[PDB]
């Protein structure tokens, strides 16, 4: 395990962008949630970018 | 409140419990007297709720040629026999 850890590249999964995260499904998840009661407008993005595609 | 129940160690406080989510389907059921349809359905409504008539069309028109009902099976049989024997 300790040897495999060394070999494993951990730096590739790091994303320098808010709202973009890794998912165990093997995808990039995009999050964007906002509310507006005054104008009656609520948005919740749940976009996924699959690797296999 | 929230989307789901948070089981994480970060959210284990007494201040995170309770509340109920809004649901349109459920709002028209919760706290509402039930009414049976038996002995209440009019004559103008079918079993599935579809509109129903109570008068012939002829009468309806008066107070406001067609395709034959049955088909021709004999012609179909004879035409199939002719086509197979040709």
């Amino acid at each position: 395990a300790k040897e495999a850890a060394k070999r494993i590249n951990w730096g590739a999964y790091i994303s320098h962008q808010r709202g973009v995260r890794w998912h165990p499904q093997g995808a990039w998840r995009v999050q964007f949630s906002r509310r507006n009661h005054e104008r009656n407008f609520f948005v919740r993005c749940e976009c996924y970018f699959r690797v296999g595609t | 409140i929230a989307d789901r129940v948070r089981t994480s160690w970060t959210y284990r406080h007494s201040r995170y419990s309770g509340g109920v989510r809004f649901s349109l389907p459920r709002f028209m059921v919760t706290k509402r007297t039930y009414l049976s349809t038996k002995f209440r359905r009019p004559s103008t409504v079918t079993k599935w709720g579809n509109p129903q008539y109570t008068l012939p069309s002829n009468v309806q028109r008066e107070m406001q040629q067609h395709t034959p009902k049955y088909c021709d099976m004999l012609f179909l049989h004879q035409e199939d026999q002719q086509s197979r024997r040709r």
């Binding site: 395990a1 495999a4 070999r7 494993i8 590249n9 951990w10 590739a12 999964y13 | -």
Partner: protein, 202 residues
């Protein structure tokens, strides 16, 4: 390493038809190739049902002229059967090659998505509409006279005029179809070996 070279002997109505030779794409489809080679060689032993996983003495349950011919069932031999070395079913593979050649090999599928088994089928003509739905892993190298004879036993309804069964199998010891896209290198953070090692304790 060189690609495998498997052979199949077909018998039409108890008569020795000939001997067809196929080349598997191990380079691109290692898993798929391996499966077929192990089934042909019969070096895996029994199976789920205590049956030998060998293509020897298997009938072809489907012969459609000009479209394709199905077969490979080892359990019942009718079509409602199959078993891979890995188990019942195995995951699919990347769809690289098309169906634009005579004699191409490809695995079968069930109503479900991932239902690949020993069941394969040889294409008689180009099948563009089959692109992306099936995995191509083999190509006929010699013995087209046997496929030509086999095509004669098919009917539009998928009927069979005379019995068609594989007599003998084995492996020989000593241009590619079009591509759907252009393969390119990818970033592989986690090594392959790790996945194997994880399943055993490490």
């Amino acid at each position: 390493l060189p690609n495998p070279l498997v052979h199949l002997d077909i018998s039409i109505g108890g008569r020795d038809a000939g001997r067809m030779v196929f080349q598997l794409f191990a380079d691109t489809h290692p898993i798929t190739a391996e499966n077929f080679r192990c089934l042909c060689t019969g070096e895996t032993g029994l199976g789920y049902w205590m049956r030998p996983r060998w293509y020897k003495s298997t009938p072809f349950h489907r012969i459609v002229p000009g479209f394709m011919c199905q077969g490979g069932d080892i359990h019942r031999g009718d079509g409602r059967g199959g078993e891979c070395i890995y188990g019942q079913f195995f995951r699919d593979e990347r769809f690289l090659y098309k169906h634009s050649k005579r004699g191409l090999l490809s695995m079968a599928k069930a109503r479900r998505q991932h239902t690949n088994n020993s069941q394969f089928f040889i294409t008689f003509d180009a099948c563009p509409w089959l692109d992306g739905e099936h995995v191509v892993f083999g190509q006929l190298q010699s013995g087209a006279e046997v496929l030509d004879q086999i095509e004669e036993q098919g009917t539009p309804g998928g009927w069979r005029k005379r019995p068609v069964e594989i007599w003998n199998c084995g492996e020989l010891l000593l241009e590619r179809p079009e591509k759907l896209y252009e393969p390119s290198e990818q970033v592989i953070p986690i090594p392959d070996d790790v996945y194997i090692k994880a399943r055993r304790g490490f």
